[PDB]
Amino acid sequence: EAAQSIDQLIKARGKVYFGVATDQNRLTTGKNAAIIKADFGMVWPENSMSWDATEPSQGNFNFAGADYLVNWAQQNGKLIGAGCLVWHNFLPSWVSSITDKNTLINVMKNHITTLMTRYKGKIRTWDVVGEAFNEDGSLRQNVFLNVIGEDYIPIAFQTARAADPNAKLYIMDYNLDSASYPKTQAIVNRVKQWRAAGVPIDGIGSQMHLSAGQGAGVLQALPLLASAGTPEVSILMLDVAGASPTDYVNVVNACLNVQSCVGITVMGVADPDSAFASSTPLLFDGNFNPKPAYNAIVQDLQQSI
C-alpha cells in the first residue's frame, strides 16, 4: 500500500529519520530486517555498543556485534546512531572498581576514542553521556562522578568531538517526559551551562520509555528540552505501555512541533522482542503486523499538494 513507511513520511515532513534499535540477532530473525528496510531510516545497536559488549576487559575491545550492525546499516542505506559511551549501565566491573581520577579519565577517553575512531564518519549520532541525572535533577553519583567529579561530562564530550567531529554528540536521559519534573528542568539548565562553557553537546535525547497516558506531557516536555539550545533534540528508546495511538501520536506531534527535533527512535520492532513484552508497547505485534499505533502515526504523518 502507498505511503506506509513512517520514516519516509517523517522525512517528507522535514525530519531526518524514524529509527529503531536492533542488532544481529534481530536482523537475522522474524521480519525485522524487512520492516526496517521498508519503514525505518536509522538504526542503533540495541546492546552491541555497550561498554560490556565492547570493552569487556581493559583496553581489549570486541567489535564483532557492533560491526555487524554498522555493516548492515550501510548495506541498507540506513543512518546509524550508537551509544552509550559513558553511563552507569552495562559497565564492566573493571571500570567500576577504578578509584583514581586520572586513571578513570583516561579509561573513559580511551573507550570513547576507540569506539568513535573505529566508526569515524559512519555514525550520525553518538549518545556520549547517558543517565547522568538523578530524579531530583542533581547529577547521578555513578563511578564517573564519584571518581572524576562533574568534569567527566565536559571531558567525555570534548573527547568525542575530537574523535569524530562529524558525529552529533548527545546527552540522553529518561524521565524527561514531564515539563514540571525536576529532572527535565535540570538537564535543560545544565546543558545550557555546559554549552555556554563550550562543551560540544549537539543534542539532548529523551529516552521515552512511557507508561500509558504519558504521551500528552511530552508535548510540553520536548519543547522544554529544546529550550536548552542544542542544535538537535531526539526521541530515543521509544515505547509506550499499551501502545495507545493517542500516546504515540502525541509523541510524534511533539517531534513535529519542535523544530530542532530531528527524529524518533523506537526501542524495537515487535512486541515479543521488547524487554517489556507483557506491556505490548511497540508498533508491531508478535506476528509482525503493524498495530493501530503504527497506522495512527502513518495517518498523522501523511500530508493533497
Ligand SMILES: O=[N+]([O-])c1ccc2nn[nH]c2c1
Ligand atoms: O534509541 N534507542 O533505542 C537507543 C537504544 C540503545 C542506545 N544506546 N545508546 N543510545 C541508544 C539509543
